[PDB]
């Protein structure tokens, strides 16, 4: 199944887990839930190595869950686990490297990368929906769908990542509220666990893709991106006022169609949101 690595190997291949950012000579590519993701080089392959870093038993459960989800769920719109390490007191997960990093970072053009075209943004939206559909068809709920979690390969194929908190499946509740508040549905923020909450967060991701803005920005008004939906519905603004200006191939018709998907995902009432299959078909129609 997955390759078993010993910690020593992964130390050696990451400049001993050099935590400086890759841009300044280290191996750190970013930080990712409850761990740091390092670049490694092993037997002709660049790999991503997440070393997990709030108790030990809970961290270990998240590690075991990541492994179980990935063993059951292989799909081109999900991240691929190559292996792991559990010997000693560290836990590592080793994945196929995604050379274009996160959607978040490509939206902000971090490190000077060129802006994504509308045509590419449409493919990424479709791919990400196809990943989430796969997960929901397999009765998993992700719980932290966001742009920082949609990775992008050499061809800008979208891959969903981070399954440490994912859950199997009738809407249950929890005491341990998890996710990222800027993306989270009202009912997730109160502790329900439902696939309908992934739909909502995807909504926010769709806004990010349209606008190029982050989901939250403390120095902006509104500080939360999901607030623009209300500005647009209460006639104060149009989707055209917010469309990312860093593209020249966006047409009104497809942009309005993606915004219409996003609006529907973002319904306050969970039972009025489309399910992922519907999102997927709408996103396919936007492009046809």
Ligand X SMILES: O=C(Nc1cc2nc(N3CCOCC3)oc2cc1N1CCCCC1)c1cccc(-c2cnc3[nH]ccc3c2)n1
**CA pair distance 90, 56, nearest whole angstrom:** 10
Q: Using the rule CB under 6 A, which residue among 27, 50, 136, 286 binds ligand X?
A: 50
78 sits near ligand X (criterion: CB under 6 A):
no
CB 94, CB 37: distance < 8 Å? no
Six-digit token string for 50: 């997440």
Q: Is 112 helix (H, G, I), strand (E, B) or coil?
A: helix
Q: What is the dihedral of CA 142, 260, 126, 69, to 10 degrees?
A: 10
Q: Which candidate, 100, 135, 94, places its Cα nearest to that of 120?
A: 100
String of contacts with ligand X for each residue 118-157, x by CB under 6 A: ------------------------------xx-x------
Catalytic residue, chosen from 144, 153, 217, 275, is 144
**CA pair distance 68, 102, nearest whole angstrom:** 23
Residue 231 beta carbon to ligand X: minimum distance, rounded to whole angstroms? 30
Catalytic residue flag (residue 217):
no
Q: How far apart are the first and last CA of the chain?
A: 38
Q: Using the rule CB under 6 A, which residue among 14, 85, 86, 102 binds ligand X?
A: 102
101 sits near ligand X (criterion: CB under 6 A):
yes
* Contact window for ligand X (CB under 6 A) among 97-105, 128-136, 206-214, 240-248: 97-105
Active site residues: 144
The residues that touch ligand X, with contacts defined as CB under 6 A, are 29-30, 32-33, 37, 48, 50, 79, 95, 97-99, 101-102, 111, 148-149, 151, 161-162
């Amino acid at each position: 199944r997955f390759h078993s690595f010993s910690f020593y190997e992964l130390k050696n291949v990451t400049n001993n887990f050099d935590e400086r950012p890759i841009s300044v000579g280290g191996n750190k590519m970013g930080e990712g839930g409850f761990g740091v993701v390092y670049k490694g080089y092993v037997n002709n392959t660049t790999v991503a190595v997440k070393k997990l870093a709030i108790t030990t038993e809970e961290l270990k459960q998240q590690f075991d869950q990541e492994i179980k989800v990935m063993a059951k769920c292989q799909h081109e719109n999900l991240v691929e686990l190559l292996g792991f390490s559990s010997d000693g007191d560290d836990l590592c997960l080793v994945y196929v490297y995604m050379p274009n990093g996160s959607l978040l970072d490509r939206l902000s053009c971090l490190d000077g990368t060129p802006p994504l075209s509308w045509h590419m943004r449409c493919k990424i939206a479709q791919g990400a929906a196809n990943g989430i559909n796969f997960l929901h068809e397999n009765h998993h709920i992700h719980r932290d769908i966001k742009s920082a979690n949609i990775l992008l390969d050499e061809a800008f194929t979208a891959k969903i990542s981070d399954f440490g908190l994912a859950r199997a499946s009738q809407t249950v509740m929890t005491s341990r509220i998890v996710g990222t508040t800027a993306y989270m549905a009202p009912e997730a923020l109160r502790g329900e666990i439902t696939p309908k909450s992934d739909i909502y967060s995807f909504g926010v991701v769709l806004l990010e893709i349209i606008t190029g803005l982050p989901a939250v920005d403390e120095h902006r008004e509104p500080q939360l991106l999901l607030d623009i939906k209300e500005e647009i519905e209460d006639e104060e603004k149009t989707i055209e006022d917010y469309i990312d200006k860093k593209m020249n191939d966006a047409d009104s018709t497809s942009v309005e169609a993606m915004y219409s998907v996003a609006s529907q995902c973002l319904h306050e009432k969970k039972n009025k949101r489309p399910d992922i299959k519907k999102v997927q078909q709408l996103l396919q129609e936007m492009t046809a």
